[PDB]
């Protein structure tokens, strides 16, 4: 259900493998490819509710470093129109005095199509 390629409304793509142990591993997109890691409920309830998950990307790679990281929190909904609904937080490293403006909040939805 979760393993495979997902597309965000804006162009971004993520490729992920969901292990039997509750692990998420993959990449977020060559100068713009980045490593991701996360966890998920490997035994969800059967009564129709979604499957909880989360993952992180640090924005550094062989070609650039933005000195920041994003975390996504949300749930997988199965079916014909499968989707992953998230909210995210983006934190940048800052000095002592600019800490208050260090974190962005947003949201996103991913589909298979």
């Amino acid at each position: 259900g979760i393993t495979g390629t997902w597309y965000a409304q804006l162009g971004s793509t993520f490729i992920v493998t969901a292990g039997a142990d509750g692990a998420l591993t993959g990449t977020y997109e060559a100068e713009s490819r980045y490593v991701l890691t996360g966890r998920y409920d490997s035994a969800p309830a059967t009564d129709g509710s979604g499957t909880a998950l989360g993952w992180t990307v640090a924005w550094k790679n062989n070609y650039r470093n933005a000195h920041s990281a994003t975390t996504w929190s949300g749930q997988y909904v199965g079916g014909a129109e499968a989707r992953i609904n998230t909210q995210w937080l983006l934190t940048s490293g800052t000095t002592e005095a600019n800490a208050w403006k260090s974190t962005l909040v947003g949201h996103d939805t991913f589909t298979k199509v």
Copy 2:
């Protein structure tokens, strides 16, 4: 700097290893111990700003399953009074109609002491 044991203001403890590759691995606390995974800026700026990081915990283990997950986003600040400042999002798996009440937001600070 980041490897080691951290304590949250409320009692929670987390033990983490920061790899050379930008990886975070460890545990969050036996019936209450859980696996965590994340990423961090392995080459931060030198001008005094903090080090960006994030991690995820799925709330399932050999003893219980709360059908949910938490993600933490924030930064490490070094020195004599080292600390990690975060904001977090907690998502539970829900039905279609209760999705709107699915996600909590909060914050936390961790110290070495």
Copy 3:
């Protein structure tokens, strides 16, 4: 531009008056009608960016009291397909020990249609 009736994707409706002073006043929907109050940028930039605003609703009225309140933060975008894009926080009054689970985060978009 902002004065008038707005509809949320789920059925909710809000009626608002934007004063010359930067004030927002109106109602959010008879047992389910509630008073709202807010503020907005009464002199936005001309270069195409949106108009910042925010408002609050306390969930008490002559017929019920849910001991909570929601605040919306976002921006107005003008044109043929005018819209207001927000993120919101919902806080409930809690005891000392359950404070950590006191606040929900979500998002919403409103249209004229």
Copy 4:
């Protein structure tokens, strides 16, 4: 309980009047003084839980305009060490393409002292 002067951990001050109707009116601090408006639970539960409230400030005044607004969501806790605990969202007006980076999230605590 709520009427009066409150001080944030960083220097900011806010002066507010809580009406019998569930209204909040006041100012947030002369070139740096701004109008605020909000709402609160005028009949909270008696079992010890806090009193839910929210307010908004638009960052424009006779001396400057930052084309943005902040909303605060949280609760009042009474007693000898009275306090107001909040989380806030700050939205700036942006173009179509920079919308994703438009909103900051943070937190704050206010005291009487």
